[PDB]
Amino acid sequence: KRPKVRDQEGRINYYWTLLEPGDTIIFEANGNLIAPRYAFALSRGFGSGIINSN
Amino acid sequence: CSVAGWILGNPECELLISRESWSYIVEKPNPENGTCYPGHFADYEELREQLSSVSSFERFEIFPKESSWPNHTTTGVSASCSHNGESSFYKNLLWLTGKNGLYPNLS
Amino acid sequence: KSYANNKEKEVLVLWGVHHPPNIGDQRALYHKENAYVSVVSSHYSRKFTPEIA
């Protein structure tokens, strides 16, 4: 039991990973899996960032 | 919405789905439309660092909804994550529940 | 047990988990072969288990 937040008491823990090219990922589960539907093909280039502004 | 909400596909900001290339990301100082379902985002700051150096990405169906889980029901909606009032869920994740009273193992 | 923060300032909470030297101390102090401790909060969740050795 956990404190109530946003009209929900159960909590989902979010995890992520980076698959290198030419590699395989395997999901095994018998319960409590929030499976992926969309992945992202990252193209890396210098000269960016995240800023906070109004 | 924040980087977590953008990357998980928060139901209440889908206008960023179309965008694929950028020069920099602008986030509100105190974002409010983040992870709708409460919980912990593992290595959130590391993911922000990784996304600080991506010029573009392509969104693809890692596991197609229509033809990947025939032994499970892939329709799970939360009251917390509600689009236009109607309950919904993240656009990049699937909540899986037992079908016919059974939850088979998946690999 | 539980405690809600009502002091409006950050509160440092210190606790511990005991590992008895042998199974005998585990079954005498607590009368239980295996034990579990779970400390949870809004943004900190952990489950400790005895490591008898």
Looking up tokens 């943004």 gives C43
In Å, the largest CA–CA distance within chain B is 49
A18 touches chain B (CB under 8 A): yes
Extended beta strands in chain B, E state? 25-27, 54-61, 72-73, 78-83, 86-88, 93-95, 97-98
Q: How far is CA B81 from CA B12, B63, B85, in A?
A: 8, 22, 9
- Cβ within 8 Å of residue B19, ≥6 positions away: none
Residues A12, C20: Cα–Cα separation, whole Å: 34
Q: Tell me the technique behind this structure.
A: cryo-EM
- Tell me, in Å, the resolution of the deposited structure: 2.8
Q: Helix/strand/coil (H, E, C) string of B4-15?
A: HHHHHCCCCCCC
Chain A residues in contact with C47 by the CB 8 A cut-off are: none
> Contacts of residue B93 in chain A, CB cutoff 8 Å?
34-37
CA B10 to chain centre: 6
